[PDB]
PDB file of all heavy atoms in Angstrom:
ATOM      1  N   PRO A   1      48.741  42.699 122.193  1.00 35.12           N
ATOM      2  CA  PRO A   1      47.369  42.187 122.109  1.00 35.12           C
ATOM      3  C   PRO A   1      46.280  43.183 122.510  1.00 35.12           C
ATOM      4  O   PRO A   1      45.117  43.020 122.138  1.00 35.12           O
ATOM      5  CB  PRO A   1      47.407  40.970 123.027  1.00 35.12           C
ATOM      6  CG  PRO A   1      48.789  40.451 122.806  1.00 35.12           C
ATOM      7  CD  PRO A   1      49.619  41.718 122.855  1.00 35.12           C
ATOM      8  N   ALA A   2      46.654  44.209 123.269  1.00 35.55           N
ATOM      9  CA  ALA A   2      45.697  45.219 123.706  1.00 35.55           C
ATOM     10  C   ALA A   2      45.085  45.931 122.501  1.00 35.55           C
ATOM     11  O   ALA A   2      43.868  45.932 122.322  1.00 35.55           O
ATOM     12  CB  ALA A   2      46.379  46.230 124.620  1.00 35.55           C
ATOM     13  N   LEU A   3      45.942  46.531 121.678  1.00 37.38           N
ATOM     14  CA  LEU A   3      45.499  47.248 120.486  1.00 37.38           C
ATOM     15  C   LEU A   3      44.560  46.423 119.613  1.00 37.38           C
ATOM     16  O   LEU A   3      43.669  46.968 118.964  1.00 37.38           O
ATOM     17  CB  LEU A   3      46.706  47.677 119.646  1.00 37.38           C
ATOM     18  CG  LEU A   3      47.524  48.893 120.084  1.00 37.38           C
ATOM     19  CD1 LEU A   3      48.764  49.007 119.209  1.00 37.38           C
ATOM     20  CD2 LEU A   3      46.676  50.154 119.974  1.00 37.38           C
ATOM     21  N   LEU A   4      44.763  45.109 119.599  1.00 41.56           N
ATOM     22  CA  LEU A   4      43.941  44.219 118.786  1.00 41.56           C
ATOM     23  C   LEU A   4      42.641  43.779 119.453  1.00 41.56           C
ATOM     24  O   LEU A   4      41.725  43.307 118.780  1.00 41.56           O
ATOM     25  CB  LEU A   4      44.756  42.988 118.378  1.00 41.56           C
ATOM     26  CG  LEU A   4      45.946  43.279 117.459  1.00 41.56           C
ATOM     27  CD1 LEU A   4      46.750  42.009 117.218  1.00 41.56           C
ATOM     28  CD2 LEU A   4      45.433  43.853 116.145  1.00 41.56           C
ATOM     29  N   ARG A   5      42.556  43.931 120.770  1.00 42.49           N
ATOM     30  CA  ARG A   5      41.350  43.540 121.490  1.00 42.49           C
ATOM     31  C   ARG A   5      40.151  44.323 120.960  1.00 42.49           C
ATOM     32  O   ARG A   5      40.296  45.451 120.492  1.00 42.49           O
ATOM     33  CB  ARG A   5      41.524  43.796 122.983  1.00 42.49           C
ATOM     34  N   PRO A   6      38.947  43.729 121.023  1.00 42.23           N
ATOM     35  CA  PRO A   6      37.728  44.389 120.542  1.00 42.23           C
ATOM     36  C   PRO A   6      37.564  45.792 121.115  1.00 42.23           C
ATOM     37  O   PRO A   6      37.741  46.006 122.314  1.00 42.23           O
ATOM     38  CB  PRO A   6      36.622  43.449 121.008  1.00 42.23           C
ATOM     39  CG  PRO A   6      37.274  42.114 120.923  1.00 42.23           C
ATOM     40  CD  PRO A   6      38.640  42.379 121.529  1.00 42.23           C
ATOM     41  N   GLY A   7      37.217  46.741 120.253  1.00 44.30           N
ATOM     42  CA  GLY A   7      37.040  48.112 120.693  1.00 44.30           C
ATOM     43  C   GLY A   7      38.165  48.986 120.182  1.00 44.30           C
ATOM     44  O   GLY A   7      38.048  50.212 120.139  1.00 44.30           O
ATOM     45  N   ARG A   8      39.262  48.344 119.794  1.00 44.51           N
ATOM     46  CA  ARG A   8      40.429  49.045 119.273  1.00 44.51           C
ATOM     47  C   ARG A   8      40.608  48.654 117.809  1.00 44.51           C
ATOM     48  O   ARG A   8      39.760  48.965 116.973  1.00 44.51           O
ATOM     49  CB  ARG A   8      41.679  48.671 120.077  1.00 44.51           C
ATOM     50  CG  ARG A   8      41.569  48.928 121.577  1.00 44.51           C
ATOM     51  CD  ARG A   8      40.650  47.922 122.254  1.00 44.51           C
ATOM     52  NE  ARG A   8      40.485  48.192 123.680  1.00 44.51           N
ATOM     53  CZ  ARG A   8      41.474  48.174 124.567  1.00 44.51           C
ATOM     54  NH1 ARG A   8      42.712  47.895 124.179  1.00 44.51           N
ATOM     55  NH2 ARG A   8      41.227  48.435 125.844  1.00 44.51           N
ATOM     56  N   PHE A   9      41.711  47.980 117.499  1.00 47.86           N
ATOM     57  CA  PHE A   9      41.965  47.537 116.133  1.00 47.86           C
ATOM     58  C   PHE A   9      41.472  46.101 115.967  1.00 47.86           C
ATOM     59  O   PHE A   9      42.255  45.193 115.690  1.00 47.86           O
ATOM     60  CB  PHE A   9      43.464  47.616 115.804  1.00 47.86           C
ATOM     61  CG  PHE A   9      43.982  49.022 115.635  1.00 47.86           C
ATOM     62  CD1 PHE A   9      44.120  49.868 116.731  1.00 47.86           C
ATOM     63  CD2 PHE A   9      44.320  49.501 114.373  1.00 47.86           C
ATOM     64  CE1 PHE A   9      44.585  51.175 116.570  1.00 47.86           C
ATOM     65  CE2 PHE A   9      44.786  50.806 114.203  1.00 47.86           C
ATOM     66  CZ  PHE A   9      44.918  51.643 115.303  1.00 47.86           C
ATOM     67  N   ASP A  10      40.168  45.900 116.142  1.00 44.89           N
ATOM     68  CA  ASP A  10      39.584  44.570 116.016  1.00 44.89           C
ATOM     69  C   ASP A  10      39.149  44.289 114.581  1.00 44.89           C
ATOM     70  O   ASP A  10      38.081  43.722 114.344  1.00 44.89           O
ATOM     71  CB  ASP A  10      38.386  44.432 116.957  1.00 44.89           C
ATOM     72  CG  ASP A  10      37.365  45.528 116.756  1.00 44.89           C
ATOM     73  OD1 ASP A  10      36.956  45.747 115.599  1.00 44.89           O
ATOM     74  OD2 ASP A  10      36.970  46.167 117.749  1.00 44.89           O
ATOM     75  N   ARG A  11      39.986  44.683 113.625  1.00 45.07           N
ATOM     76  CA  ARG A  11      39.689  44.476 112.211  1.00 45.07           C
ATOM     77  C   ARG A  11      40.965  44.532 111.378  1.00 45.07           C
ATOM     78  O   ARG A  11      41.505  45.608 111.119  1.00 45.07           O
ATOM     79  CB  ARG A  11      38.698  45.541 111.723  1.00 45.07           C
ATOM     80  CG  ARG A  11      38.372  45.489 110.231  1.00 45.07           C
ATOM     81  CD  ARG A  11      37.840  44.128 109.793  1.00 45.07           C
ATOM     82  NE  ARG A  11      37.261  44.176 108.451  1.00 45.07           N
ATOM     83  CZ  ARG A  11      36.158  44.851 108.141  1.00 45.07           C
ATOM     84  NH1 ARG A  11      35.509  45.536 109.076  1.00 45.07           N
ATOM     85  NH2 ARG A  11      35.699  44.848 106.896  1.00 45.07           N
ATOM     86  N   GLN A  12      41.447  43.366 110.961  1.00 42.19           N
ATOM     87  CA  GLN A  12      42.658  43.294 110.158  1.00 42.19           C
ATOM     88  C   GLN A  12      42.344  42.977 108.701  1.00 42.19           C
ATOM     89  O   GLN A  12      41.530  42.101 108.406  1.00 42.19           O
ATOM     90  CB  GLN A  12      43.599  42.222 110.702  1.00 42.19           C
ATOM     91  CG  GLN A  12      43.979  42.374 112.162  1.00 42.19           C
ATOM     92  CD  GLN A  12      45.011  41.343 112.582  1.00 42.19           C
ATOM     93  OE1 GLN A  12      45.305  41.181 113.767  1.00 42.19           O
ATOM     94  NE2 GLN A  12      45.574  40.639 111.602  1.00 42.19           N
ATOM     95  N   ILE A  13      42.987  43.699 107.792  1.00 42.24           N
ATOM     96  CA  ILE A  13      42.798  43.470 106.366  1.00 42.24           C
ATOM     97  C   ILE A  13      44.159  43.144 105.764  1.00 42.24           C
ATOM     98  O   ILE A  13      45.158  43.790 106.085  1.00 42.24           O
ATOM     99  CB  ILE A  13      42.202  44.711 105.666  1.00 42.24           C
ATOM    100  CG1 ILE A  13      40.770  44.948 106.152  1.00 42.24           C
ATOM    101  CG2 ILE A  13      42.214  44.513 104.157  1.00 42.24           C
ATOM    102  CD1 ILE A  13      40.047  46.077 105.435  1.00 42.24           C
ATOM    103  N   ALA A  14      44.204  42.141 104.894  1.00 42.04           N
ATOM    104  CA  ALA A  14      45.463  41.733 104.283  1.00 42.04           C
ATOM    105  C   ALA A  14      45.760  42.398 102.946  1.00 42.04           C
ATOM    106  O   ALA A  14      44.999  42.265 101.990  1.00 42.04           O
ATOM    107  CB  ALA A  14      45.488  40.217 104.124  1.00 42.04           C
ATOM    108  N   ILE A  15      46.873  43.120 102.889  1.00 42.36           N
ATOM    109  CA  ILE A  15      47.290  43.783 101.663  1.00 42.36           C
ATOM    110  C   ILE A  15      48.547  43.056 101.195  1.00 42.36           C
ATOM    111  O   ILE A  15      49.663  43.434 101.546  1.00 42.36           O
ATOM    112  CB  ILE A  15      47.611  45.273 101.914  1.00 42.36           C
ATOM    113  CG1 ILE A  15      46.445  45.942 102.646  1.00 42.36           C
ATOM    114  CG2 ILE A  15      47.850  45.988 100.594  1.00 42.36           C
ATOM    115  CD1 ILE A  15      45.134  45.906 101.884  1.00 42.36           C
ATOM    116  N   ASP A  16      48.360  42.004 100.408  1.00 42.17           N
ATOM    117  CA  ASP A  16      49.484  41.209  99.931  1.00 42.17           C
ATOM    118  C   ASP A  16      50.110  41.750  98.651  1.00 42.17           C
ATOM    119  O   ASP A  16      49.602  42.696  98.046  1.00 42.17           O
ATOM    120  CB  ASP A  16      49.032  39.762  99.712  1.00 42.17           C
ATOM    121  CG  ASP A  16      47.640  39.497 100.259  1.00 42.17           C
ATOM    122  OD1 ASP A  16      46.699  40.198  99.831  1.00 42.17           O
ATOM    123  OD2 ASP A  16      47.487  38.593 101.109  1.00 42.17           O
ATOM    124  N   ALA A  17      51.227  41.148  98.252  1.00 43.51           N
ATOM    125  CA  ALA A  17      51.908  41.561  97.034  1.00 43.51           C
ATOM    126  C   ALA A  17      50.934  41.305  95.891  1.00 43.51           C
ATOM    127  O   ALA A  17      50.212  40.308  95.894  1.00 43.51           O
ATOM    128  CB  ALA A  17      53.184  40.755  96.839  1.00 43.51           C
ATOM    129  N   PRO A  18      50.894  42.209  94.901  1.00 48.13           N
ATOM    130  CA  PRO A  18      49.980  42.043  93.767  1.00 48.13           C
ATOM    131  C   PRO A  18      50.163  40.719  93.026  1.00 48.13           C
ATOM    132  O   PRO A  18      51.269  40.189  92.948  1.00 48.13           O
ATOM    133  CB  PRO A  18      50.294  43.259  92.896  1.00 48.13           C
ATOM    134  CG  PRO A  18      51.748  43.501  93.172  1.00 48.13           C
ATOM    135  CD  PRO A  18      51.838  43.317  94.665  1.00 48.13           C
ATOM    136  N   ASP A  19      49.072  40.177  92.495  1.00 45.22           N
ATOM    137  CA  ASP A  19      49.151  38.919  91.763  1.00 45.22           C
ATOM    138  C   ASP A  19      49.561  39.191  90.322  1.00 45.22           C
ATOM    139  O   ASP A  19      49.651  40.345  89.906  1.00 45.22           O
ATOM    140  CB  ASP A  19      47.804  38.193  91.780  1.00 45.22           C
ATOM    141  CG  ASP A  19      46.697  39.005  91.145  1.00 45.22           C
ATOM    142  OD1 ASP A  19      46.860  40.240  91.031  1.00 45.22           O
ATOM    143  OD2 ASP A  19      45.664  38.407  90.769  1.00 45.22           O
ATOM    144  N   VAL A  20      49.801  38.124  89.566  1.00 43.72           N
ATOM    145  CA  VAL A  20      50.211  38.241  88.170  1.00 43.72           C
ATOM    146  C   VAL A  20      49.519  39.398  87.454  1.00 43.72           C
ATOM    147  O   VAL A  20      50.182  40.258  86.872  1.00 43.72           O
ATOM    148  CB  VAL A  20      49.933  36.933  87.395  1.00 43.72           C
ATOM    149  CG1 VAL A  20      48.460  36.560  87.502  1.00 43.72           C
ATOM    150  CG2 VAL A  20      50.339  37.097  85.937  1.00 43.72           C
ATOM    151  N   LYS A  21      48.191  39.420  87.498  1.00 42.83           N
ATOM    152  CA  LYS A  21      47.427  40.478  86.848  1.00 42.83           C
ATOM    153  C   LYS A  21      47.730  41.817  87.507  1.00 42.83           C
ATOM    154  O   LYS A  21      47.983  42.813  86.827  1.00 42.83           O
ATOM    155  CB  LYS A  21      45.939  40.178  86.937  1.00 42.83           C
ATOM    156  N   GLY A  22      47.704  41.827  88.837  1.00 41.84           N
ATOM    157  CA  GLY A  22      47.978  43.045  89.577  1.00 41.84           C
ATOM    158  C   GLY A  22      49.274  43.682  89.117  1.00 41.84           C
ATOM    159  O   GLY A  22      49.303  44.859  88.757  1.00 41.84           O
ATOM    160  N   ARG A  23      50.347  42.896  89.130  1.00 40.17           N
ATOM    161  CA  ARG A  23      51.652  43.380  88.701  1.00 40.17           C
ATOM    162  C   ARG A  23      51.567  43.908  87.274  1.00 40.17           C
ATOM    163  O   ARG A  23      52.192  44.916  86.932  1.00 40.17           O
ATOM    164  CB  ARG A  23      52.694  42.257  88.769  1.00 40.17           C
ATOM    165  CG  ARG A  23      53.091  41.852  90.180  1.00 40.17           C
ATOM    166  CD  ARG A  23      54.299  40.920  90.168  1.00 40.17           C
ATOM    167  NE  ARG A  23      54.015  39.622  89.562  1.00 40.17           N
ATOM    168  CZ  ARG A  23      53.331  38.648  90.156  1.00 40.17           C
ATOM    169  NH1 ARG A  23      52.856  38.818  91.382  1.00 40.17           N
ATOM    170  NH2 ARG A  23      53.121  37.501  89.525  1.00 40.17           N
ATOM    171  N   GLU A  24      50.783  43.224  86.447  1.00 45.90           N
ATOM    172  CA  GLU A  24      50.610  43.613  85.054  1.00 45.90           C
ATOM    173  C   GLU A  24      50.062  45.031  84.965  1.00 45.90           C
ATOM    174  O   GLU A  24      50.560  45.856  84.198  1.00 45.90           O
ATOM    175  CB  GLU A  24      49.650  42.652  84.355  1.00 45.90           C
ATOM    176  CG  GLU A  24      49.576  42.847  82.853  1.00 45.90           C
ATOM    177  CD  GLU A  24      48.464  42.035  82.218  1.00 45.90           C
ATOM    178  OE1 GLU A  24      47.282  42.345  82.474  1.00 45.90           O
ATOM    179  OE2 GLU A  24      48.774  41.088  81.467  1.00 45.90           O
ATOM    180  N   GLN A  25      49.029  45.306  85.755  1.00 47.72           N
ATOM    181  CA  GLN A  25      48.407  46.622  85.775  1.00 47.72           C
ATOM    182  C   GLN A  25      49.421  47.673  86.210  1.00 47.72           C
ATOM    183  O   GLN A  25      49.547  48.724  85.581  1.00 47.72           O
ATOM    184  CB  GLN A  25      47.214  46.619  86.724  1.00 47.72           C
ATOM    185  N   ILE A  26      50.141  47.381  87.288  1.00 42.20           N
ATOM    186  CA  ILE A  26      51.145  48.299  87.813  1.00 42.20           C
ATOM    187  C   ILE A  26      52.198  48.635  86.761  1.00 42.20           C
ATOM    188  O   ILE A  26      52.507  49.805  86.533  1.00 42.20           O
ATOM    189  CB  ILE A  26      51.854  47.702  89.044  1.00 42.20           C
ATOM    190  CG1 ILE A  26      50.822  47.321  90.108  1.00 42.20           C
ATOM    191  CG2 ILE A  26      52.834  48.715  89.622  1.00 42.20           C
ATOM    192  CD1 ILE A  26      51.418  46.640  91.322  1.00 42.20           C
TER     193      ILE A  26
END
């Protein structure tokens, strides 16, 4: 929880598996 506390990594972004279209492009 330290790393995630404000001032450190207080910003998470979700990189999920590509969607139907995404996979299509790939």
Side-chain angles (χ1 to χ4, degrees), residues 1-4 6-20 22-24 26:
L3 282 172
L4 295 175
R8 304 73 183 298
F9 288 71
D10 54 51
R11 176 56 167 293
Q12 304 185 190
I13 293 185
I15 308 300
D16 350 57
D19 60 340
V20 56
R23 289 190 293 284
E24 189 189 68
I26 304 176

